[PDB]
Amino acid sequence: SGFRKMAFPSGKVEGCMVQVTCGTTTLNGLWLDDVVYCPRHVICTSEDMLNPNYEDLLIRKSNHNFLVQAGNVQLRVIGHSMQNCVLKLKVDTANPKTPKYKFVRIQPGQTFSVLACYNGSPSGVYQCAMRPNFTIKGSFLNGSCGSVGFNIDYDCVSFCYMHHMELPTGVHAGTDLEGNFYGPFVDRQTAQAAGTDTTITVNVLAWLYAAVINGDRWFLNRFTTTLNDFNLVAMKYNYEPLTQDHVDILGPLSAQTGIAVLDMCASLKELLQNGMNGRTILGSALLEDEFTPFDVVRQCSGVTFQ
């Protein structure tokens, strides 16, 4: 029992992180086989970030302008290509520690672990969600660019995020590992306001099932509701609409607890309308939305990784 914000073990990713320096800009790269992936804004100075022309800045860059360091060892760069907002630096040495891996583009609401790095060295690991406005609420200082977000299924690392920018509101934006930003964000130091940070309704429901499995039951009310009646209450509180697909995904937690999905919706509706009256749920005085249904099952079942 107990329920924590749990990250994936970071060992398989720690062995992939390097340092990439181009001129006076230093950030993190990901070394998988004979390719290092990093943010293309490695080629920019502080002044270039206001209005950068990446094609033009790239012309003054050769293979030898990219210093890739893994510990006390420099990798030789044998080729470079810009794919969307990432650079692919081809190196002459395949990473001996390369794990089984995949690149995935995740949906809003999906969670992943971040290994925050500085100078190609890991600082720590935490669990994040891709918010419905395509920002993440991370912990990133100067130098953290090129840190990655990932999921693990047994022995295969699914890379889903690379860190590129902090918006003026202190929230984060970045790309998949093909270099395509999540949401409308660009790698320019300009005005880019995030949209409404809506709550991930299906994740709140998962987390309430986790509470029930763990003994926190005070919020279980006497009521049920429909998807349409719940969505009319949800809209007011900036909650994502709940769909049939969401009901389906909560099926296994429904089955384990014997609480119907729509009964758990009516409990949630009462928490939204009435508040929590200073009570807590799994030691939080807010409704937590950064656990997926999959995350609840995994943590409550003790699923392990090769």
Added chain:
Amino acid sequence: SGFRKMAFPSGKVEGCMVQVTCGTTTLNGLWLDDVVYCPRHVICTSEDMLNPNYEDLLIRKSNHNFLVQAGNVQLRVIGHSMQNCVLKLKVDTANPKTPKYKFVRIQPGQTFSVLACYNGSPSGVYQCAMRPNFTIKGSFLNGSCGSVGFNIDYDCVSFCYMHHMELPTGVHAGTDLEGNFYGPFVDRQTAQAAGTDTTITVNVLAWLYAAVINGDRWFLNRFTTTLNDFNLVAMKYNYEPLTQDHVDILGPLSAQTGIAVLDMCASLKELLQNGMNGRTILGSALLEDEFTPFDVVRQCSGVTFQ
């Protein structure tokens, strides 16, 4: 910017975890050099846990009764000794992945990362605190015994916790790596009620400095206080007494923010007396007490590990 519950990267510890089976009981061991450390209750059946005589149960156990498995490889056990509540199984192969390490016994209020394991395989990593009642609020299912808690200073892993038991209230108890329980807990399946779970006052203060550094300033009030006046308010709310040593430790956060420690105490006193009025601080509607002053500095400075 941003502030997360951040664990240490788990790679150095992942490579130390093994599976230990004695008869029909399977749990986790820690393989450091040619010694595997595990909970002595590996030698117990379910019925033995009600009233176990460890010296007597140990007499029916030989070197060959301990099956230690690292992946598809069995380690040979060449000696065993019980030290307090841990077994030290001497194996013929020194762990090639042994990192620089230390065993430390931590104080109440200190934080550490847990690598939760099942069958010697890592499931995930999270940040915990040793509570003032010497319990931890973890996430542990059947089979998690022998999972470890640790801190990292550059390249040296300080092991501080091994998981042994879940109390009937769903909170956790375990030992240092010399096998001495934290607090009055024993490895028996009996009535052992935890004392008052008091709030770690110095950690709340650290976390309020983190909030200030990150832009959350609404709670900064117009007042100051003394240690004695604050402690008279703290006692009522089951907050640990604040000492001069605590004031000293908050010195660096005081210096960085320009907010005197006693001014931050008066802000805290107002939050305790008046509540948070449904406002949040670093996305929490409660006062978080599982960040040390050291943890705030580390996360706000970007300290990395070799």
